[PDB]
Amino acid sequence: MEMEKEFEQIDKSGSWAAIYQDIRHEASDFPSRVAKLPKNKNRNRYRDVSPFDHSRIKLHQEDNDYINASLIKMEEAQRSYILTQGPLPNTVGHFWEMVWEQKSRGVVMLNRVMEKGSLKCAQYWPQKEEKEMIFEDTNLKLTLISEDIKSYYTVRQLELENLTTQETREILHFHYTTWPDFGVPESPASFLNFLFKVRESGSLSPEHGPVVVHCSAGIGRSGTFCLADTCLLLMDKRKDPSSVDIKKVLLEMRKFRMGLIQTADQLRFSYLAVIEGAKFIMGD
């Protein structure tokens, strides 16, 4: 069922809240024992958001390998993503260890450091070229090289150096700065633009590690980003683009991380973004 019609149907019926609840109900449930251990309580930002044990990312170190991060592996679309929470004070060092060890090229950021008057993640990159950041627990150095600021998003070039071996890599930081404090954007135009800029960079391509994407919890806006990407990629690849069922993709992704897509407004916005994106993917 062409999602564009399915859309007008739900919209006129005002059924979005029931569709979304159908997904909550059918969504997988798997253990999260490692995340609930007591030594990891201060590695989790929210008590109700944990990664499944079967898909969690592990840090390469014997001490404690835990981080609140999941690998979503979309097998038909040939895309991989790592979804993680905005880093905490005591986990910024683990975050950049993750980026190193998985050979990622891009970081994608969908939230501001402060929203609604509270802190939604730590200031985990450097803001001035001459003031670099050092992470002593994981022996890494991080430096700002350039910065390109636009109306709807900002792109930064950073240099991550492994102090133990002195290798260095170039990481790209894609920071979407204008998602409203409440609800969702009225148009997907700028969110879709942001995506194509991430695509154009190479950061989603298989010659690199998986991309790291995050918001505050790593399930809401982060969910919207990679559901849209995958869905548009599938419309390119199939004989019949109208066979792409967005609810089925979401449910497949939710086998890898709980909670993806947090409200019914987001679900709707996701549909909207794919429909407009399609009107480039299918030649226009």
PDB file of C-alpha atoms in Angstrom:
ATOM      1  CA  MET A   1       0.000   0.000   0.000  1.00  0.00           C
ATOM      2  CA  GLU A   2       1.594   3.219  -1.328  1.00  0.00           C
ATOM      3  CA  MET A   3       2.545   4.970   1.907  1.00  0.00           C
ATOM      4  CA  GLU A   4       1.263   8.264   0.478  1.00  0.00           C
ATOM      5  CA  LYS A   5      -2.295   6.933   0.495  1.00  0.00           C
ATOM      6  CA  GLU A   6      -1.871   5.032   3.762  1.00  0.00           C
ATOM      7  CA  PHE A   7      -0.818   8.487   4.997  1.00  0.00           C
ATOM      8  CA  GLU A   8      -3.863  10.474   3.883  1.00  0.00           C
ATOM      9  CA  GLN A   9      -5.947   7.642   5.343  1.00  0.00           C
ATOM     10  CA  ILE A  10      -4.484   7.837   8.851  1.00  0.00           C
ATOM     11  CA  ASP A  11      -4.394  11.657   8.753  1.00  0.00           C
ATOM     12  CA  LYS A  12      -8.062  12.126   7.868  1.00  0.00           C
ATOM     13  CA  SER A  13      -9.036   9.369  10.315  1.00  0.00           C
ATOM     14  CA  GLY A  14      -6.802  10.906  12.974  1.00  0.00           C
ATOM     15  CA  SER A  15      -5.541   7.420  13.857  1.00  0.00           C
ATOM     16  CA  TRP A  16      -1.856   8.166  14.360  1.00  0.00           C
ATOM     17  CA  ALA A  17      -1.990   7.449  18.072  1.00  0.00           C
ATOM     18  CA  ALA A  18      -3.350   3.925  17.505  1.00  0.00           C
ATOM     19  CA  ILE A  19      -0.950   2.963  14.697  1.00  0.00           C
ATOM     20  CA  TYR A  20       1.947   3.999  16.970  1.00  0.00           C
ATOM     21  CA  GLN A  21       0.509   1.941  19.839  1.00  0.00           C
ATOM     22  CA  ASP A  22       0.254  -1.109  17.519  1.00  0.00           C
ATOM     23  CA  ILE A  23       4.030  -0.862  17.052  1.00  0.00           C
ATOM     24  CA  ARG A  24       4.718  -0.504  20.807  1.00  0.00           C
ATOM     25  CA  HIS A  25       2.710  -3.679  21.247  1.00  0.00           C
ATOM     26  CA  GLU A  26       4.278  -5.862  18.517  1.00  0.00           C
ATOM     27  CA  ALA A  27       7.843  -4.728  19.193  1.00  0.00           C
ATOM     28  CA  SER A  28      10.452  -7.233  20.239  1.00  0.00           C
ATOM     29  CA  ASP A  29      11.643  -7.708  23.800  1.00  0.00           C
ATOM     30  CA  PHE A  30      15.070  -9.183  24.639  1.00  0.00           C
ATOM     31  CA  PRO A  31      17.260  -9.117  27.765  1.00  0.00           C
ATOM     32  CA  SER A  32      19.383  -6.174  28.894  1.00  0.00           C
ATOM     33  CA  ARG A  33      21.226  -7.785  31.807  1.00  0.00           C
ATOM     34  CA  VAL A  34      24.617  -6.119  31.280  1.00  0.00           C
ATOM     35  CA  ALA A  35      23.061  -2.627  31.230  1.00  0.00           C
ATOM     36  CA  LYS A  36      21.219  -3.185  34.489  1.00  0.00           C
ATOM     37  CA  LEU A  37      24.260  -4.317  36.464  1.00  0.00           C
ATOM     38  CA  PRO A  38      24.991  -1.947  39.384  1.00  0.00           C
ATOM     39  CA  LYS A  39      28.531  -1.006  38.277  1.00  0.00           C
ATOM     40  CA  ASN A  40      26.928   0.477  35.123  1.00  0.00           C
ATOM     41  CA  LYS A  41      24.233   2.661  36.639  1.00  0.00           C
ATOM     42  CA  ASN A  42      26.295   5.814  36.128  1.00  0.00           C
ATOM     43  CA  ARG A  43      26.902   4.851  32.457  1.00  0.00           C
ATOM     44  CA  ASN A  44      23.164   5.190  31.689  1.00  0.00           C
ATOM     45  CA  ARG A  45      21.418   8.534  31.269  1.00  0.00           C
ATOM     46  CA  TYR A  46      17.867   7.184  31.557  1.00  0.00           C
ATOM     47  CA  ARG A  47      16.689   4.154  33.563  1.00  0.00           C
ATOM     48  CA  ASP A  48      14.169   3.006  30.924  1.00  0.00           C
ATOM     49  CA  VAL A  49      16.585   3.100  27.935  1.00  0.00           C
ATOM     50  CA  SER A  50      19.068   0.245  27.692  1.00  0.00           C
ATOM     51  CA  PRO A  51      20.634  -1.689  24.853  1.00  0.00           C
ATOM     52  CA  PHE A  52      19.789  -5.368  24.290  1.00  0.00           C
ATOM     53  CA  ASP A  53      22.651  -7.694  25.200  1.00  0.00           C
ATOM     54  CA  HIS A  54      22.565  -9.353  21.765  1.00  0.00           C
ATOM     55  CA  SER A  55      23.343  -6.122  19.835  1.00  0.00           C
ATOM     56  CA  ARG A  56      25.312  -3.948  22.282  1.00  0.00           C
ATOM     57  CA  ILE A  57      28.637  -2.365  21.318  1.00  0.00           C
ATOM     58  CA  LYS A  58      31.555  -3.469  23.506  1.00  0.00           C
ATOM     59  CA  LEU A  59      34.605  -1.409  24.413  1.00  0.00           C
ATOM     60  CA  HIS A  60      37.930  -3.208  23.866  1.00  0.00           C
ATOM     61  CA  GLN A  61      39.201  -3.272  27.401  1.00  0.00           C
ATOM     62  CA  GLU A  62      39.181  -5.884  30.143  1.00  0.00           C
ATOM     63  CA  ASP A  63      38.078  -3.552  32.972  1.00  0.00           C
ATOM     64  CA  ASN A  64      34.478  -2.801  31.986  1.00  0.00           C
ATOM     65  CA  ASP A  65      33.306  -3.090  28.418  1.00  0.00           C
ATOM     66  CA  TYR A  66      29.905  -1.405  28.775  1.00  0.00           C
ATOM     67  CA  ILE A  67      28.569   1.587  26.846  1.00  0.00           C
ATOM     68  CA  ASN A  68      24.926   2.448  26.093  1.00  0.00           C
ATOM     69  CA  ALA A  69      25.174   1.814  22.346  1.00  0.00           C
ATOM     70  CA  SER A  70      23.549  -0.589  19.852  1.00  0.00           C
ATOM     71  CA  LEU A  71      24.438  -1.834  16.324  1.00  0.00           C
ATOM     72  CA  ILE A  72      21.410  -1.788  13.984  1.00  0.00           C
ATOM     73  CA  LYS A  73      22.198  -4.042  10.985  1.00  0.00           C
ATOM     74  CA  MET A  74      19.748  -3.627   8.108  1.00  0.00           C
ATOM     75  CA  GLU A  75      20.498  -6.559   5.926  1.00  0.00           C
ATOM     76  CA  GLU A  76      18.459  -5.913   2.765  1.00  0.00           C
ATOM     77  CA  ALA A  77      19.463  -2.231   2.612  1.00  0.00           C
ATOM     78  CA  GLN A  78      23.148  -3.007   3.272  1.00  0.00           C
ATOM     79  CA  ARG A  79      23.331  -0.267   5.881  1.00  0.00           C
ATOM     80  CA  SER A  80      24.731  -0.354   9.396  1.00  0.00           C
ATOM     81  CA  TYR A  81      24.235   2.243  12.122  1.00  0.00           C
ATOM     82  CA  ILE A  82      25.364   2.650  15.754  1.00  0.00           C
ATOM     83  CA  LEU A  83      22.793   4.368  17.943  1.00  0.00           C
ATOM     84  CA  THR A  84      23.960   5.751  21.298  1.00  0.00           C
ATOM     85  CA  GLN A  85      22.851   8.188  23.952  1.00  0.00           C
ATOM     86  CA  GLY A  86      24.284  11.663  24.250  1.00  0.00           C
ATOM     87  CA  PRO A  87      27.422  11.189  26.334  1.00  0.00           C
ATOM     88  CA  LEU A  88      27.544  11.842  30.043  1.00  0.00           C
ATOM     89  CA  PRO A  89      30.291  13.547  32.017  1.00  0.00           C
ATOM     90  CA  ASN A  90      31.851  10.219  32.992  1.00  0.00           C
ATOM     91  CA  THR A  91      31.426   8.588  29.498  1.00  0.00           C
ATOM     92  CA  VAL A  92      32.914  11.118  27.027  1.00  0.00           C
ATOM     93  CA  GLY A  93      36.145   9.109  27.109  1.00  0.00           C
ATOM     94  CA  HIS A  94      34.308   5.868  26.342  1.00  0.00           C
ATOM     95  CA  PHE A  95      32.415   7.536  23.486  1.00  0.00           C
ATOM     96  CA  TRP A  96      35.553   8.516  21.545  1.00  0.00           C
ATOM     97  CA  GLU A  97      37.073   5.085  22.302  1.00  0.00           C
ATOM     98  CA  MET A  98      34.012   3.666  20.605  1.00  0.00           C
ATOM     99  CA  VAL A  99      34.501   5.949  17.598  1.00  0.00           C
ATOM    100  CA  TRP A 100      38.106   4.834  17.256  1.00  0.00           C
ATOM    101  CA  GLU A 101      37.556   1.086  17.717  1.00  0.00           C
ATOM    102  CA  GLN A 102      34.698   0.801  15.249  1.00  0.00           C
ATOM    103  CA  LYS A 103      36.560   2.868  12.604  1.00  0.00           C
ATOM    104  CA  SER A 104      33.724   5.354  12.197  1.00  0.00           C
ATOM    105  CA  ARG A 105      34.096   8.389   9.907  1.00  0.00           C
ATOM    106  CA  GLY A 106      31.102  10.534  10.902  1.00  0.00           C
ATOM    107  CA  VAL A 107      29.315  11.514  14.122  1.00  0.00           C
ATOM    108  CA  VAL A 108      25.724  12.729  13.703  1.00  0.00           C
ATOM    109  CA  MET A 109      24.158  14.911  16.418  1.00  0.00           C
ATOM    110  CA  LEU A 110      20.434  15.708  16.446  1.00  0.00           C
ATOM    111  CA  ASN A 111      20.152  17.680  19.724  1.00  0.00           C
ATOM    112  CA  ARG A 112      21.527  20.803  21.399  1.00  0.00           C
ATOM    113  CA  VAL A 113      23.718  20.620  24.494  1.00  0.00           C
ATOM    114  CA  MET A 114      21.040  22.532  26.419  1.00  0.00           C
ATOM    115  CA  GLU A 115      17.328  22.163  25.671  1.00  0.00           C
ATOM    116  CA  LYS A 116      14.321  23.217  27.794  1.00  0.00           C
ATOM    117  CA  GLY A 117      16.685  24.803  30.292  1.00  0.00           C
ATOM    118  CA  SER A 118      18.400  21.481  31.155  1.00  0.00           C
ATOM    119  CA  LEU A 119      21.563  19.682  29.975  1.00  0.00           C
ATOM    120  CA  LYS A 120      20.806  17.083  27.309  1.00  0.00           C
ATOM    121  CA  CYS A 121      24.383  15.916  26.711  1.00  0.00           C
ATOM    122  CA  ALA A 122      27.940  16.801  27.630  1.00  0.00           C
ATOM    123  CA  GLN A 123      30.171  19.189  25.686  1.00  0.00           C
ATOM    124  CA  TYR A 124      32.259  16.350  24.221  1.00  0.00           C
ATOM    125  CA  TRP A 125      34.129  18.185  21.394  1.00  0.00           C
ATOM    126  CA  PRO A 126      36.400  21.291  21.426  1.00  0.00           C
ATOM    127  CA  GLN A 127      35.051  24.701  20.539  1.00  0.00           C
ATOM    128  CA  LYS A 128      38.323  26.485  19.660  1.00  0.00           C
ATOM    129  CA  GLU A 129      41.232  25.392  17.463  1.00  0.00           C
ATOM    130  CA  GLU A 130      43.859  26.302  20.043  1.00  0.00           C
ATOM    131  CA  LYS A 131      42.092  24.595  23.014  1.00  0.00           C
ATOM    132  CA  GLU A 132      42.249  20.860  22.350  1.00  0.00           C
ATOM    133  CA  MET A 133      40.609  18.233  24.598  1.00  0.00           C
ATOM    134  CA  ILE A 134      42.372  15.252  26.179  1.00  0.00           C
ATOM    135  CA  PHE A 135      40.708  12.101  27.538  1.00  0.00           C
ATOM    136  CA  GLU A 136      43.104  10.544  29.991  1.00  0.00           C
ATOM    137  CA  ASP A 137      41.175   7.379  30.890  1.00  0.00           C
ATOM    138  CA  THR A 138      41.207   6.255  27.231  1.00  0.00           C
ATOM    139  CA  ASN A 139      44.457   7.960  26.040  1.00  0.00           C
ATOM    140  CA  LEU A 140      42.999   9.977  23.155  1.00  0.00           C
ATOM    141  CA  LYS A 141      43.452  13.552  21.910  1.00  0.00           C
ATOM    142  CA  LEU A 142      40.819  15.548  20.013  1.00  0.00           C
ATOM    143  CA  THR A 143      41.357  18.811  18.077  1.00  0.00           C
ATOM    144  CA  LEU A 144      39.127  21.196  16.140  1.00  0.00           C
ATOM    145  CA  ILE A 145      40.450  21.900  12.614  1.00  0.00           C
ATOM    146  CA  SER A 146      37.625  23.846  10.960  1.00  0.00           C
ATOM    147  CA  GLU A 147      33.958  24.712  11.318  1.00  0.00           C
ATOM    148  CA  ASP A 148      31.272  25.603   8.733  1.00  0.00           C
ATOM    149  CA  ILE A 149      28.056  27.041  10.276  1.00  0.00           C
ATOM    150  CA  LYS A 150      24.735  27.265   8.395  1.00  0.00           C
ATOM    151  CA  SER A 151      21.125  28.191   9.080  1.00  0.00           C
ATOM    152  CA  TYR A 152      19.952  24.614   9.793  1.00  0.00           C
ATOM    153  CA  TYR A 153      23.101  22.603  10.681  1.00  0.00           C
ATOM    154  CA  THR A 154      26.879  22.882  11.319  1.00  0.00           C
ATOM    155  CA  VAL A 155      29.754  20.745   9.984  1.00  0.00           C
ATOM    156  CA  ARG A 156      33.045  20.383  11.828  1.00  0.00           C
ATOM    157  CA  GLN A 157      36.319  18.753  10.895  1.00  0.00           C
ATOM    158  CA  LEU A 158      38.050  17.157  13.871  1.00  0.00           C
ATOM    159  CA  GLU A 159      41.291  15.250  14.367  1.00  0.00           C
ATOM    160  CA  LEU A 160      41.247  12.209  16.678  1.00  0.00           C
ATOM    161  CA  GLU A 161      44.714  10.970  17.687  1.00  0.00           C
ATOM    162  CA  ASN A 162      45.433   7.729  19.522  1.00  0.00           C
ATOM    163  CA  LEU A 163      48.082   8.731  22.027  1.00  0.00           C
ATOM    164  CA  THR A 164      49.268   5.129  22.459  1.00  0.00           C
ATOM    165  CA  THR A 165      50.306   4.647  18.802  1.00  0.00           C
ATOM    166  CA  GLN A 166      50.160   8.265  17.519  1.00  0.00           C
ATOM    167  CA  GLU A 167      47.874   7.436  14.614  1.00  0.00           C
ATOM    168  CA  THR A 168      45.439  10.216  13.696  1.00  0.00           C
ATOM    169  CA  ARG A 169      42.137  10.216  11.802  1.00  0.00           C
ATOM    170  CA  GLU A 170      39.758  12.843  10.430  1.00  0.00           C
ATOM    171  CA  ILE A 171      36.251  12.630  11.943  1.00  0.00           C
ATOM    172  CA  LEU A 172      33.367  14.635  10.505  1.00  0.00           C
ATOM    173  CA  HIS A 173      30.791  16.045  12.970  1.00  0.00           C
ATOM    174  CA  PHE A 174      27.307  16.628  11.514  1.00  0.00           C
ATOM    175  CA  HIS A 175      25.309  18.674  14.061  1.00  0.00           C
ATOM    176  CA  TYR A 176      21.641  19.428  13.309  1.00  0.00           C
ATOM    177  CA  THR A 177      20.925  22.535  15.385  1.00  0.00           C
ATOM    178  CA  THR A 178      17.271  23.509  14.838  1.00  0.00           C
ATOM    179  CA  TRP A 179      14.989  20.730  15.978  1.00  0.00           C
ATOM    180  CA  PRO A 180      12.344  22.464  18.145  1.00  0.00           C
ATOM    181  CA  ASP A 181      12.224  21.988  21.922  1.00  0.00           C
ATOM    182  CA  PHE A 182       8.691  20.532  21.665  1.00  0.00           C
ATOM    183  CA  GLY A 183       7.183  18.451  18.897  1.00  0.00           C
ATOM    184  CA  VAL A 184       8.638  18.120  15.400  1.00  0.00           C
ATOM    185  CA  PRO A 185       9.597  20.303  12.447  1.00  0.00           C
ATOM    186  CA  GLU A 186       6.754  21.585  10.361  1.00  0.00           C
ATOM    187  CA  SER A 187       8.571  20.735   7.099  1.00  0.00           C
ATOM    188  CA  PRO A 188      11.044  17.863   6.498  1.00  0.00           C
ATOM    189  CA  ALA A 189      12.901  19.926   3.925  1.00  0.00           C
ATOM    190  CA  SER A 190      15.872  20.799   6.123  1.00  0.00           C
ATOM    191  CA  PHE A 191      16.033  17.393   7.822  1.00  0.00           C
ATOM    192  CA  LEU A 192      16.178  15.722   4.371  1.00  0.00           C
ATOM    193  CA  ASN A 193      18.829  18.193   3.223  1.00  0.00           C
ATOM    194  CA  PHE A 194      20.835  17.312   6.377  1.00  0.00           C
ATOM    195  CA  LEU A 195      20.673  13.622   5.467  1.00  0.00           C
ATOM    196  CA  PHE A 196      21.886  14.074   1.910  1.00  0.00           C
ATOM    197  CA  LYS A 197      24.824  16.054   3.255  1.00  0.00           C
ATOM    198  CA  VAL A 198      25.688  13.140   5.519  1.00  0.00           C
ATOM    199  CA  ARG A 199      25.384  10.783   2.556  1.00  0.00           C
ATOM    200  CA  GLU A 200      27.519  12.990   0.306  1.00  0.00           C
ATOM    201  CA  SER A 201      30.342  12.849   2.834  1.00  0.00           C
ATOM    202  CA  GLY A 202      31.005   9.131   2.486  1.00  0.00           C
ATOM    203  CA  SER A 203      30.251   8.560   6.190  1.00  0.00           C
ATOM    204  CA  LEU A 204      27.429   6.030   5.531  1.00  0.00           C
ATOM    205  CA  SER A 205      29.433   4.008   2.973  1.00  0.00           C
ATOM    206  CA  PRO A 206      30.889   0.547   3.624  1.00  0.00           C
ATOM    207  CA  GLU A 207      34.508   1.420   3.152  1.00  0.00           C
ATOM    208  CA  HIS A 208      34.192   2.874   6.690  1.00  0.00           C
ATOM    209  CA  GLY A 209      32.999   1.759  10.060  1.00  0.00           C
ATOM    210  CA  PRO A 210      29.354   2.389  10.917  1.00  0.00           C
ATOM    211  CA  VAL A 211      28.253   5.894  11.625  1.00  0.00           C
ATOM    212  CA  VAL A 212      27.578   6.976  15.235  1.00  0.00           C
ATOM    213  CA  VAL A 213      24.268   8.826  15.614  1.00  0.00           C
ATOM    214  CA  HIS A 214      22.814  10.238  18.843  1.00  0.00           C
ATOM    215  CA  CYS A 215      20.283  12.544  20.453  1.00  0.00           C
ATOM    216  CA  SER A 216      19.693  12.619  24.196  1.00  0.00           C
ATOM    217  CA  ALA A 217      18.347   9.100  24.684  1.00  0.00           C
ATOM    218  CA  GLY A 218      19.316   7.788  21.228  1.00  0.00           C
ATOM    219  CA  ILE A 219      15.928   6.435  20.138  1.00  0.00           C
ATOM    220  CA  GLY A 220      13.712   9.350  19.215  1.00  0.00           C
ATOM    221  CA  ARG A 221      15.290  11.709  16.707  1.00  0.00           C
ATOM    222  CA  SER A 222      18.057   9.159  16.163  1.00  0.00           C
ATOM    223  CA  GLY A 223      15.356   6.721  15.168  1.00  0.00           C
ATOM    224  CA  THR A 224      13.867   9.137  12.680  1.00  0.00           C
ATOM    225  CA  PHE A 225      17.202   9.651  10.978  1.00  0.00           C
ATOM    226  CA  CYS A 226      18.042   6.034  10.197  1.00  0.00           C
ATOM    227  CA  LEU A 227      14.491   4.830   9.515  1.00  0.00           C
ATOM    228  CA  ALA A 228      14.222   7.488   6.832  1.00  0.00           C
ATOM    229  CA  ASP A 229      17.589   6.718   5.293  1.00  0.00           C
ATOM    230  CA  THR A 230      16.950   2.991   5.127  1.00  0.00           C
ATOM    231  CA  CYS A 231      13.462   3.425   3.742  1.00  0.00           C
ATOM    232  CA  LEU A 232      14.593   5.740   0.934  1.00  0.00           C
ATOM    233  CA  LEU A 233      17.496   3.419   0.132  1.00  0.00           C
ATOM    234  CA  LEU A 234      15.048   0.533  -0.204  1.00  0.00           C
ATOM    235  CA  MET A 235      12.829   2.559  -2.584  1.00  0.00           C
ATOM    236  CA  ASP A 236      15.856   3.002  -4.871  1.00  0.00           C
ATOM    237  CA  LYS A 237      16.720  -0.691  -4.836  1.00  0.00           C
ATOM    238  CA  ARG A 238      13.381  -2.420  -5.479  1.00  0.00           C
ATOM    239  CA  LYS A 239      11.511  -3.160  -8.717  1.00  0.00           C
ATOM    240  CA  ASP A 240       8.450  -1.747  -7.007  1.00  0.00           C
ATOM    241  CA  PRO A 241       9.124   1.216  -4.618  1.00  0.00           C
ATOM    242  CA  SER A 242       5.506   1.140  -3.296  1.00  0.00           C
ATOM    243  CA  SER A 243       6.280  -2.208  -1.580  1.00  0.00           C
ATOM    244  CA  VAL A 244       8.247  -0.407   1.162  1.00  0.00           C
ATOM    245  CA  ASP A 245       6.292  -0.785   4.422  1.00  0.00           C
ATOM    246  CA  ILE A 246       7.643   1.773   6.875  1.00  0.00           C
ATOM    247  CA  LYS A 247       6.016   0.072   9.858  1.00  0.00           C
ATOM    248  CA  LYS A 248       7.778  -3.193   8.984  1.00  0.00           C
ATOM    249  CA  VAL A 249      11.154  -1.515   8.758  1.00  0.00           C
ATOM    250  CA  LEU A 250      10.681   0.172  12.134  1.00  0.00           C
ATOM    251  CA  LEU A 251       9.748  -3.192  13.655  1.00  0.00           C
ATOM    252  CA  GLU A 252      12.848  -4.825  12.147  1.00  0.00           C
ATOM    253  CA  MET A 253      15.056  -2.059  13.512  1.00  0.00           C
ATOM    254  CA  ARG A 254      13.440  -2.388  16.955  1.00  0.00           C
ATOM    255  CA  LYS A 255      14.873  -5.920  17.172  1.00  0.00           C
ATOM    256  CA  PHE A 256      18.206  -4.201  17.715  1.00  0.00           C
ATOM    257  CA  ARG A 257      17.382  -1.236  19.978  1.00  0.00           C
ATOM    258  CA  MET A 258      14.257  -0.719  22.100  1.00  0.00           C
ATOM    259  CA  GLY A 259      12.073   2.347  21.742  1.00  0.00           C
ATOM    260  CA  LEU A 260      13.015   3.663  18.286  1.00  0.00           C
ATOM    261  CA  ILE A 261      10.512   6.466  17.529  1.00  0.00           C
ATOM    262  CA  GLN A 262       9.191   7.934  20.804  1.00  0.00           C
ATOM    263  CA  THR A 263       5.879   9.612  19.913  1.00  0.00           C
ATOM    264  CA  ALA A 264       3.155   9.412  17.335  1.00  0.00           C
ATOM    265  CA  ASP A 265       4.163  12.847  16.028  1.00  0.00           C
ATOM    266  CA  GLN A 266       7.582  11.415  15.195  1.00  0.00           C
ATOM    267  CA  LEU A 267       6.048   8.430  13.382  1.00  0.00           C
ATOM    268  CA  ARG A 268       3.992  10.818  11.252  1.00  0.00           C
ATOM    269  CA  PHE A 269       6.983  13.044  10.588  1.00  0.00           C
ATOM    270  CA  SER A 270       8.913   9.947   9.481  1.00  0.00           C
ATOM    271  CA  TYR A 271       6.277   9.114   6.897  1.00  0.00           C
ATOM    272  CA  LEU A 272       6.332  12.741   5.751  1.00  0.00           C
ATOM    273  CA  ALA A 273      10.079  12.754   5.369  1.00  0.00           C
ATOM    274  CA  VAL A 274      10.148   9.599   3.264  1.00  0.00           C
ATOM    275  CA  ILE A 275       7.360  10.739   0.973  1.00  0.00           C
ATOM    276  CA  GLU A 276       9.103  14.014   0.159  1.00  0.00           C
ATOM    277  CA  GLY A 277      12.477  12.329  -0.096  1.00  0.00           C
ATOM    278  CA  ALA A 278      11.011   9.829  -2.561  1.00  0.00           C
ATOM    279  CA  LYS A 279      10.275  12.801  -4.843  1.00  0.00           C
ATOM    280  CA  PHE A 280      13.964  12.984  -5.483  1.00  0.00           C
ATOM    281  CA  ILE A 281      14.830   9.257  -5.265  1.00  0.00           C
ATOM    282  CA  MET A 282      12.351   8.391  -8.061  1.00  0.00           C
ATOM    283  CA  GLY A 283      13.881  10.797 -10.576  1.00  0.00           C
ATOM    284  CA  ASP A 284      12.252  14.073  -9.657  1.00  0.00           C
TER     285      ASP A 284
END
